[PDB]
Amino acid sequence: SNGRNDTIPVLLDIAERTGNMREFINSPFRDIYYRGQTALHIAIERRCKHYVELLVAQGADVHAQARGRFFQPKDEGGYFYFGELPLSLAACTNQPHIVNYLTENPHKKADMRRQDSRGNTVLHALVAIADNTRE
Amino acid sequence: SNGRNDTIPVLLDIAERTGNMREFINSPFRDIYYRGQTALHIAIERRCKHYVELLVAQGADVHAQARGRFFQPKDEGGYFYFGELPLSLAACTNQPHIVNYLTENPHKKADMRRQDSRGNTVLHALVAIADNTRENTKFVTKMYDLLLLKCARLFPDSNLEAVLNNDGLSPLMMAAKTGKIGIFQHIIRREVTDEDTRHLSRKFKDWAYGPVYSSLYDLSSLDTCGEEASVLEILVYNSKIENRHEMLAVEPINELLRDKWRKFGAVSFYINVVSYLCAMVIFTLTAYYQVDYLRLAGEVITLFTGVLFFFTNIKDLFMKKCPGVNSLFIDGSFQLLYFIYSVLVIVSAALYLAGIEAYLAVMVFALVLGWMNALYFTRGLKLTGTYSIMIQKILFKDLFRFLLVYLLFMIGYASALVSLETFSTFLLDLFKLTIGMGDLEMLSSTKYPVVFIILLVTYIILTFVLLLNMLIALMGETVGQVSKESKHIWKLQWATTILDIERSFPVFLRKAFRSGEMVTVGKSSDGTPDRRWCFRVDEVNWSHW
Amino acid sequence: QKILFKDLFRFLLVYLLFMIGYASALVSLLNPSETFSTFLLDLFKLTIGMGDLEMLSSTKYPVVFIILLVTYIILTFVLLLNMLIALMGETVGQVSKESKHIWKLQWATTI
Ligand SMILES: Cc1nc(C)c(-c2csc(Nc3ccc(C(=O)N4[C@@H]5CC[C@H]4CN(c4ncc(C(F)(F)F)cn4)C5)cn3)n2)s1
């Protein structure tokens, strides 16, 4: 709410003492509709640059796959197909700052050449999301 | 003058000296035109704030009923209807400061729930004054919001919009029936984001994932399973036809009609059509034989269909009926055809039992009118609905007044031509001649071989060329302008068919096929969830994030 | 092809519907079985005006039969000709640009 939530820093502070920091920021939702969507996907689609920076600073993942039925083309019975990668999600939601940060960061960067399950790269996803409008 | 006269405070001082201040500043004009307009109404309508504050300071009256004939709707013979309250008058003249002050003031305040002699609240008055213009709809919607929110903050109870007038109409159905796109559309997709006053909204934000926004429209009054007054039935039946199309094309209504179609509407119609075609085939087979037991069963089936149509047409009298439905193509035009076909069938049966030999003529007329009736069921597709609308327009035009007076023109010119029982014979001969199957043998018996020659040439000219040209030009004028209202009245016909199918179902069947879904859209007093029958409409927008 | 698809089927459907209904109604006034083909042929001939009305006098009631024939002729001819003319005019005044756009497609296809 209101662009910030102070709980996450304390939650990560607890998690690192629990000794599961690599496993903590990872959540392949067993549900069919939300299969593979980790916390980085949520942080990116919420347009929260600071939280994306924080989560990638802990070194979780930059190549997580959003394989759920929700994350499928409308022809297959989905609602939003952006590719299946956090970089593809950032590119398909019009977040240039997130794309820039994910491409050039010290911790871990997602290569633009990576292909999802369908083989689509970031540009294939950008083509898929585009409709013949102006904005 | 110049916004201030200094005589008012002095006169009020004299009045308070005289000890009649309650009766001094109160002016129930006994004139029939101004029956009730007190000084507060005059102060407010002059766009003056300091004087209205000054007069209301001593507490004269704030709920004065301006029952005058001048303060009545233009349809009743007035010139300005604003409700009948100073608060409603201030709200109907775009005076946000006056309406603000009249509510949050120490001395005396006007409750927004108060109703005039018509039962109209201030929101009803705002709906009544609104028309379909930008500079009007702007402040009407803005101050309708303002008033709804203000009545929501104070009195944490049922919203002001839930108060019905003496006709049972809330502002929503009042706007739907009277035909205002502005306030009606604003109410339909009303979204309030404040936490305290959130239950007032009618369009929610169920879920969102980047550039996809699944909004959740409310169907509190749009779709009611019979046991309430509904906006949709009023829109389709009781509204201003001049402006009915633009209000059936709003966000929930059109997709709600499509959902009803897909659910039961389209499939009821196909069951409804195939049955009528089968009945028409059975009736044709029965007529072709006029085995006798089988054709008697077919005749019984035909009589059953005829009596069903007769009961359907008669039962409408005790229901929504008696408009000027003689020219409307919203199933009003086909309703008279239904009734005529049923009456022909019934009269044929009666003459079949009364011994009159003219039974078969009426029965065959019933069969042919029944096939022209089977032409009705092409409303299921726009490509065929437009064709049906055009062909029915021509049938409702071609055979009527101009063709009728064309027959009368034949009558008159036959009467003029005869003899410068022979009248009827010459009439038949001329009728055959005009089509081309007649003969010119009448020239021999003419007493004047001159005059008639040129006269017959002129008669042929007018009867054939002129009438054919004007008849063709009739559809020539129609088509170019009606290319769009063809589909407009097609939409009206489709919606009317869906709603008429829906009514015939029992209440439990309507609830079984009820559209939308129950959603907990928020919290209320005592933590009770808002269980509103809502209608999801998924959307997409790459402009706001 | 556009006229054959969208318009020819509707015209034929309406024409056959009216013809079958009215022909069955007229046969309902028969006097004795196999007269279906001959009666349909004579009605079709009378539609343009080349037919014979010899069988008309054999019916019991001449007035209603003649009136119904007149209604058949006027309604079918006027309505069907008017709908043909109106639909073709509207099509050629509306989708000429769409046909222009289309022709390019099979031109490129042929290439
Ligand atoms: C201009 C007009 N004036 C009047 C008075 C009109 C009028 C009134 S009733 C009527 N014509 C009727 C009446 C009754 C029925 C009928 O038995 N039904 C309806 C609803 C349930 C049941 C089966 N059906 C159906 N249910 C689900 C599907 C699914 F599988 F797709 F889900 C498919 N089909 C349709 C059909 N048609 N016409 S019309």
* Contact indicator for B220, B202 with CB cutoff of 8 Å: yes
* Contact indicator for B70, B78 with CB cutoff of 8 Å: yes
**Using a CB-CB distance cutoff of 8 angstroms, which residues of chain B are in contact with residue A92?**
210
Does B212 sit within 8 Å of A93, measured CB to CB?
no
How many Å is the Cα radius of gyration of chain B?
33
Does A133 sit within 8 Å of B542, measured CB to CB?
yes
CA-to-CA dists, residue C83 to B314, B388, B399, B477, angstroms? 34, 10, 16, 14
Using alpha carbons only, give the angle B259, B263, B269 rounded to the nearest 5 degrees: 105
* Contact indicator for A71, A37 with CB cutoff of 8 Å: yes
Measured CA to CA, the distance from residue C57 to residue C45 in angstroms comes to 17
* Single-letter amino acid code for the residue at B145: D
N-to-C CA span, chain A: 27
H/E/C letters for each residue in A101-116? HHHCCCCCCCCCCCCC
Residue whose entry in the numeric block shows the structure tokens 């997409």: B540
Measured CA to CA, the distance from residue B38 to residue B66 in angstroms comes to 8
Measured CA to CA, the distance from residue B94 to residue B92 in angstroms comes to 6
Measured CA to CA, the distance from residue B15 to residue A75 in angstroms comes to 80
Q: Which atom of ligand 1 is the closest one to the Cα of B264?
A: 35
CA-to-CA dists, residue B496 to B140, B221, B233, B499, angstroms? 31, 18, 8, 5
DSSP state of B468: H
* Contact indicator for B379, B493 with CB cutoff of 8 Å: yes
* Contact indicator for A72, A84 with CB cutoff of 8 Å: no
Task: Return the sign of the alpha-carbon dihedral for residues B191, B194, B195, B197.
Answer: negative
DSSP state of B80: -
CA-to-CA dists, residue B52 to B1, B43, B57, B80, angstroms? 16, 5, 8, 21
Q: Does any ligand 1 atom lie closer than 6 A to the CB of residue B497?
A: yes
Measured CA to CA, the distance from residue B307 to residue B49 in angstroms comes to 68
* Contact indicator for B379, B309 with CB cutoff of 8 Å: no
- A69: which 2 tokens? 């039925």
- B501: which 2 tokens? 């199918």
A window 72-101, beta carbon within 8 A of B: 79-80, 82, 89, 92-94
Decide: residue B374, CB within 10 A, 0-12 exposed, 13-18 middle, 19+ buried. Answer: middle
* Contact indicator for A91, A42 with CB cutoff of 8 Å: no
How many Å is the Cα radius of gyration of chain C?
20
Ligand 1 centroid, distance to B267 Cα (angstroms) = 6
Using alpha carbons only, give the angle B525, B527, B528 rounded to the nearest 5 degrees: 85
Sequence-ordered alpha helix ranges (H) in B25-133: 39-45, 50-57, 86-91, 96-103, 122-129
Reduced to 3 states (helix: H, G, I; strand: E, B; else coil), residue B20 is coil
Chain B residue with the nearest C-alpha to that of C6 = B383
- C18: which 2 tokens? 């009216």
Of B280, B398, B479, Cβ closest to residue C78: B398
* Contact indicator for A82, A71 with CB cutoff of 8 Å: yes
- B307: which 2 tokens? 């009596």
Helix axes B467-504 and C62-94, enclosed angle (nearest 10): 90
Measured CA to CA, the distance from residue A91 to residue A112 in angstroms comes to 11
Query: Any CB–CB contact under 8 A between B508 and chain A?
Result: no
| B439 among annotated binding-site residues | yes
Does B391 sit within 8 Å of C79, measured CB to CB?
yes
Where b means 16+ CB within 10 Å and e means fewer, B103-134 reads beeeeeebbbebbbebebbbbbbbbbbbeeee
Reduced to 3 states (helix: H, G, I; strand: E, B; else coil), residue B476 is helix
Of B280, B383, B394, Cβ closest to residue C79: B394
Q: Give the strand order in the sheet containing B213-218.
A: B203-208, B213-218, B531-539, B517-520
Does B538 sit within 8 Å of A79, measured CB to CB?
yes
Count how many pairs of residues, chain A against chain B, have C-beta atoms within 8 Å.
24
**Using a CB-CB distance cutoff of 8 angstroms, which residues of chain A are in contact with residue B213?**
none
Query: Any CB–CB contact under 8 A between C13 and chain B?
Result: no
Give every CB contact of residue B336 below 8 A, 6+ residues apart in sequence.
B326
Of residues B310, B296, B321, the one with CA closest to residue B345: B310
Measured CA to CA, the distance from residue B88 to residue B110 in angstroms comes to 10
Decide: residue B402, CB within 10 A, 0-12 exposed, 13-18 middle, 19+ buried. Answer: middle
Chains B and C touch (3+ CB pairs under 8 A): yes
Q: Does any ligand 1 atom lie closer than 6 A to the CB of residue B271?
A: yes
**What's the distance, CA B64 to chain centroid?**
34
Q: Does any ligand 1 atom lie closer than 6 A to the CB of residue B512?
A: no
A39 strand-pairing partners: none
C9 vs chain B: nearest CA distance in angstroms? Answer: 11
CA-to-CA dists, residue B230 to B41, B165, B173, angstroms? 35, 15, 8
**Using a CB-CB distance cutoff of 8 angstroms, which residues of chain A are in contact with residue B543?**
135
Of B209, B210, B543, Cβ closest to residue A135: B543
* Contact indicator for B99, B90 with CB cutoff of 8 Å: yes
Reduced to 3 states (helix: H, G, I; strand: E, B; else coil), residue B448 is coil
Of A47, A79, A94, Cβ closest to residue B212: A79
Using alpha carbons only, give the angle B530, B533, B534 rounded to the nearest 5 degrees: 100
Helix axes B7-18 and B50-57, enclosed angle (nearest 10): 10
Measured CA to CA, the distance from residue B346 to residue B356 in angstroms comes to 13
* Single-letter amino acid code for the residue at B181: I
Measured CA to CA, the distance from residue B265 to residue B379 in angstroms comes to 12
Ligand 1 centroid, distance to B372 Cα (angstroms) = 23
A94 vs chain B: nearest CA distance in angstroms? Answer: 9
**What's the distance, CA B240 to chain centroid?**
5
Question: Which segments of B138-234 are extended strands (E)?
Answer: 203-208, 213-218
B457 vs chain C: nearest CA distance in angstroms? Answer: 22
CB atoms within 10 A of CB A106: 7
DSSP state of B542: S
C window 45-84, beta carbon within 8 A of B: 49, 61, 64, 68, 71, 75, 78-79, 82-83
Residue whose entry in the numeric block shows the structure tokens 């007044």: B401
- The CB-side HSE value for B403 (13 A sphere, CA atoms) comes to 15
CA-to-CA dists, residue B26 to B38, B62, B102, B158, B169, angstroms? 5, 10, 17, 33, 32
CA-to-CA dists, residue A8 to A5, A24, A55, angstroms? 7, 12, 10
Of residues C76, C31, C11, the one with CA closest to residue C68: C76
* Single-letter amino acid code for the residue at B457: V
Does B371 sit within 8 Å of C21, measured CB to CB?
yes
* Single-letter amino acid code for the residue at B53: E
The technique is cryo-EM
CA-to-CA dists, residue B19 to B25, B27, B377, angstroms? 12, 17, 78
Run of H or E residues at B539: strand B531-539
Q: Does any ligand 1 atom lie closer than 6 A to the CB of residue B500?
A: yes
Q: Does any ligand 1 atom lie closer than 6 A to the CB of residue B501?
A: yes
Of B209, B210, B542, Cβ closest to residue A135: B542
Task: Return the sign of the alpha-carbon dihedral for residues B310, B314, B316, B321.
Answer: positive
| Residues B471, C40, C42, B468, Cα dihedral to 10° | 0
* Contact indicator for C43, C53 with CB cutoff of 8 Å: no
B386 vs chain A: nearest CA distance in angstroms? Answer: 31
State the maximum Cα–Cα separation within chain B, in Å, rounded to a whole number: 110
Measured CA to CA, the distance from residue C74 to residue C47 in angstroms comes to 9
Residue whose entry in the numeric block shows the structure tokens 């005529």: B340
Reduced to 3 states (helix: H, G, I; strand: E, B; else coil), residue B214 is strand
- Chain breaks after residues in chain C, where C lies over 2.5 Å from next N: 32
- Chain breaks after residues in chain A, where C lies over 2.5 Å from next N: none
Query: Any CB–CB contact under 8 A between A2 and chain B?
Result: no
Does A93 sit within 8 Å of B545, measured CB to CB?
yes
Residue B215 backbone phi and psi in degrees, to 5: -80, 155
Using alpha carbons only, give the angle B172, B266, B519 rounded to the nearest 5 degrees: 45
Reduced to 3 states (helix: H, G, I; strand: E, B; else coil), residue B205 is strand
* Contact indicator for B85, B63 with CB cutoff of 8 Å: yes
Q: What is the DSSP string of B514-538?
A: --SEEEE----GGG---EEEEEEEE
B485 vs chain C: nearest CA distance in angstroms? Answer: 14
* Contact indicator for B208, B214 with CB cutoff of 8 Å: yes
| B74 among annotated binding-site residues | no
Helix axes C9-27 and C36-48, enclosed angle (nearest 10): 120
CA-to-CA dists, residue B535 to A52, A102, B206, B249, C72, angstroms? 35, 39, 11, 16, 50
Of residues B260, B261, B241, the one with CA closest to residue B329: B241
- B173: which 2 tokens? 């159905």
Q: Which atom of ligand 1 is the closest one to the Cα of B513?
A: 20
